[PDB]
Each structure stands twice: as C-alpha cells, then as structure tokens.
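User: I've been trying to design a sequence by hand for this structure and keep getting stuck. Would you show me what you'd pick, starting by listing the structure so we're on the same page?

Assistant: Good idea, let's start from the same input. This is the structure you sent:
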C-alpha cells in the first residue's frame, strides 16, 4: 500500500467541502453520475476506431448500489476506467481541473452546487462520505483501489479480490447522519431531479 499527499489546493478544496455549512448535499449523486457518463463517453468514443477496447465489456451503463448494513452507497460504471497514473493524477492533483477557479468563485459568492462546472465534482462525495474508496480498471492497466478519509492523504494499492472487467466503482462510506441516501425513494427522487437526461441506463439496485 502506497500513501500519497494530496496537492495542497486539493486538500484545501476537500477541507472546504467538509467544513462549509451547506445543506444541499444531494448534488453529490449528480456529480458522480456525470463523471460516470463522461467516462462512458470516452470508452464509447475510443471503441469506434478500436472494437477490441470492448473485449472487457460491451455494456455501457451506470449502477447505483445502496447497502444499509455496510452503510455504503456505490456508484458503478463500465466507463474507460483509470490507469494507476490516471488515478493518482486525477484524484490527487489539480491536473486539468478548475480547482483554483472554484475556490476563488466560492469567495466571490459562488455556490458549492456549481462544483461540477470546475471539473472537481468528484470531491462532492465528501459532502456525505467520511471515507471514499475508488476501485478502477482501465484496459491498459491492472485493477487498483484508491482510498481517502481526507486529512490530506490517500492510499493506492492493487486490488485483486474481485475483478471488474473495466470501469470505475466509487464507494461512499456515508456519515452517520447521511443515511437518507440509502433510501430507495430518496435515490430515485435525486436521479429524477438531477440526472434524468443522462444518456446511459442508470439501474438502482434493490437491497
Ligand atoms: O470530478 C473530478 O475531480 C477530479 C477529477 C474529476 C473527474 N475526472 C474525470 C476523468 C474522466 C472521466 C470522468 C471524470
Ligand atoms: C474514468 C473515471 C474517472 C473518475 C474520477 F476521476 F472522477 F474519479 N470517475 C469516473 N467515474 N470515471
């Protein structure tokens, strides 16, 4: 298991997300689903010129899996996935995101719900999760598990327990007071409200 430090600005963004009083937390689902859709667009596009890219799975979809027993909500997609480098760069650094602009925006009156317009929607997961585990598999690399409870660091390790063909799984270990997001009616309401136009099937698993 390798431990990494988030780039300063990313740690600062996470702190803002976790400590800022903001009740409209439900937008976290919209942001993760949007990331999955983008990931699906990528593999869809690449498969146009190279059909073998789908040998790891032709189905392009998004699955929502609540589990009250483990108190987790998992967003799974069969998108492009992330190589080890992609994981570390995408989640541990500013990279191509608008992290800087977002933080400045918040001081200029912007709202946290606007996070997705700055390429950092993933971090909205910390509005409801105390810990986030990301399992991912890209055609060009092995399966990896990224994990962080914030605090300035994250870990990365190989993941062999259960292979996932291709894609990304975002496991949200919910805060004790955010279990409403495990309720079927609540999840359906949120998807219909913010993700009704996603161009891939979204299946809500029953417990
Ligand atoms: O929300 C986010 O915060 C950091 C990176 C990111 C999203 N990156 C990404 C890359 C490929 C497909 C979908 C999302
Ligand atoms: C390829 C990819 C990257 C991300 C993240 F970077 F936002 F985590 N999320 C998904 N779903 N898929």
């Amino acid at each position: 298991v390798e431990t990494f430090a988030f780039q300063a600005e990313i740690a600062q963004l996470m702190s803002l997300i976790i400590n800022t009083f903001y009740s409209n937390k439900e937008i976290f689902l919209r942001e993760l689903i949007s990331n999955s859709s983008d990931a699906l667009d990528k593999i869809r596009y690449e498969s146009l010129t190279d059909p073998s890219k789908l040998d790891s799975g032709k189905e392009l979809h998004i699955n929502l899996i609540p589990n009250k027993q483990d108190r987790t909500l998992t967003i799974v997609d069969t998108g492009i996935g992330m190589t080890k480098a992609d994981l570390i760069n995408n989640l541990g650094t500013i990279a191509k995101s608008g992290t800087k602009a977002f933080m400045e925006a918040l001081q200029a009156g912007a709202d946290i719900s606007m996070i997705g317009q700055f390429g950092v929607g993933f971090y909205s997961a910390y509005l409801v999760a105390e810990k986030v585990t990301v399992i991912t598999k890209h055609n060009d690399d092995e399966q990896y598990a990224w994990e962080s409870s914030a605090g300035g660091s994250f870990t990365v390790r190989t993941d062999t327990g259960e292979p996932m063909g291709r894609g990304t799984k975002v496991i949200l270990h919910l805060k004790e007071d955010q279990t409403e997001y495990l309720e079927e009616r609540r999840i359906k309401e949120i998807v219909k409200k913010h993700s009704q136009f996603i161009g891939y099937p979204i299946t809500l698993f029953v417990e």
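That's my pick for every position. To get oriented when you compare it with your attempt: The beta strands are 2-5, 62-67, 72-77, 129-137, 144-148, 153-158, 167-174, 202-204. The two ends are 32 Å apart (CA to CA).
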